[PDB]
Write an enzyme that holds these catalytic residues in place. Structure first.
Site, PDB file in Angstrom:
ATOM      1  N   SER A 119       0.799  -1.222   0.000  1.00 17.12           N
ATOM      2  CA  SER A 119       0.000   0.000   0.000  1.00 17.12           C
ATOM      3  C   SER A 119       0.829   1.268   0.000  1.00 17.12           C
ATOM      4  O   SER A 119       0.564   2.182   0.781  1.00 17.12           O
ATOM      5  CB  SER A 119      -0.926  -0.018   1.209  1.00 17.12           C
ATOM      6  OG  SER A 119      -0.169   0.054   2.401  1.00 17.12           O
ATOM      7  N   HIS A 147      -4.406  -5.222   3.363  1.00 15.36           N
ATOM      8  CA  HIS A 147      -5.194  -4.483   2.393  1.00 15.36           C
ATOM      9  C   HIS A 147      -5.893  -5.380   1.382  1.00 15.36           C
ATOM     10  O   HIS A 147      -6.697  -4.882   0.590  1.00 15.36           O
ATOM     11  CB  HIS A 147      -4.304  -3.484   1.650  1.00 15.36           C
ATOM     12  CG  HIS A 147      -3.739  -2.413   2.527  1.00 15.36           C
ATOM     13  ND1 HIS A 147      -4.237  -1.129   2.545  1.00 15.36           N
ATOM     14  CD2 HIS A 147      -2.720  -2.433   3.415  1.00 15.36           C
ATOM     15  CE1 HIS A 147      -3.548  -0.406   3.408  1.00 15.36           C
ATOM     16  NE2 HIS A 147      -2.622  -1.174   3.949  1.00 15.36           N
ATOM     17  N   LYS A 179      -8.861  -2.286   8.217  1.00 12.31           N
ATOM     18  CA  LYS A 179      -8.995  -1.591   6.942  1.00 12.31           C
ATOM     19  C   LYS A 179     -10.396  -1.667   6.358  1.00 12.31           C
ATOM     20  O   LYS A 179     -11.054  -0.640   6.185  1.00 12.31           O
ATOM     21  CB  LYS A 179      -8.005  -2.153   5.926  1.00 12.31           C
ATOM     22  CG  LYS A 179      -6.705  -1.406   5.866  1.00 12.31           C
ATOM     23  CD  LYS A 179      -5.851  -1.751   7.048  1.00 12.31           C
ATOM     24  CE  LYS A 179      -4.498  -1.115   6.942  1.00 12.31           C
ATOM     25  NZ  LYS A 179      -3.675  -1.522   8.092  1.00 12.31           N
TER      26      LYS A 179
END
Lengths: 187, 187
Positions: A119, A147, A179
């Site tokens: 990320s 993620h 997340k």
């Protein structure tokens, strides 16, 4: 809103058991654990299952918690360039041949660490090739899907879903609920 | 004057058993074997109990039969200068550190070969220091007493008798009946 203490002492309820079962069923593995912080999970895992006679090959763009957890154990560390597989295979072969430093005894264990989706770059990990290399050279695999889980795949299962890889070739999977689930913790 | 065949087939009589017992009692060990030729004994021993992953450190003045027997097995060989013990210890340490060639894995076994009395020089072997080194570094000892047995010592027992060393620190003893007993064979 209050908990008793640690899990091993009084802290377990039936809700924890239900959550562990449901996570294990969702991912596609046989069992799972749940913790209250993702940083802590990564920081305290390798300590438990590694040592200073084992080697770790980690990508050069890995998160900070992986680095802290590997540092706190003692194992030797080598890094390979991001998204480069010929270099990874070359490094694996060379480090198998060389052995431990100062003694050249065989490495007791080799672990390859990577991430589902990095990320800061938005790229993926070449999971098929990683599985091929680990099956060919008898290494181990560790994937950090922070993620990836919940937000990618036809049904939201992560990178195993994306590449059609069977979630059995990956020895340890970890992730976080921070997340894409609107919560806190890790597994 | 005739024998049947090999020992393991029909060749054994009670005389062989008596001779083996009497030799074992004479030397000071627990058991012994007798053969019909000394050259053959040395040539076919190391073949039986060694391999190509073991190392042999032999003196540079050893007899030819020892060299043939070691050659026919496959083990790595290194030699040290005659009557030099600092060099022997240095060589032992270095070869323990280095390991097998081309792989640097630990040596599976280390054997030190020597002779009771070298019959071109008339000198002896420093048996006390050899025993000290083998006990300190966990090596093995092999002594060839062809000219020593029967003809040296207060009572004729060899170099163990001469140096007062207990004939238990030496793993394998061999000799011949050709020199001082007026016969043929080995043990």
């Amino acid at each position: 809103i209050q908990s008793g203490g640690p899990r091993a002492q009084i802290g377990t309820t039936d809700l924890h058991i239900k959550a562990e079962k449901l996570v294990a069923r969702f991912i596609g593995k046989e069992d799972a654990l749940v913790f209250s912080m993702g940083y802590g999970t990564n920081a305290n895992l390798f300590n438990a299952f590694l040592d200073k006679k084992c080697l770790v090959i980690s990508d050069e763009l890995n998160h900070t918690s992986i680095r802290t957890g590997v540092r706190l154990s003692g194992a030797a560390v080598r890094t390979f360039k991001h998204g480069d597989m010929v270099g990874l295979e070359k490094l694996i072969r060379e480090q198998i041949v060389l052995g431990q430093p100062k003694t050249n005894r065989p490495w007791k264990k080799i672990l390859i660490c990577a991430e589902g989706l990095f990320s800061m770059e938005g790229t993926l990990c070449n999971l098929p090739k990683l599985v091929e290399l680990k099956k060919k050279y008898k290494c181990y695999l560790f994937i950090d899907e922070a993620h990836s889980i919940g937000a990618m795949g036809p049904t939201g299962r992560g990178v195993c879903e994306i590449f059609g890889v069977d979630p059995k070739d990956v020895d340890i999977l970890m992730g976080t609920f921070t997340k894409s689930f609107g919560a806190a913790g890790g597994y």
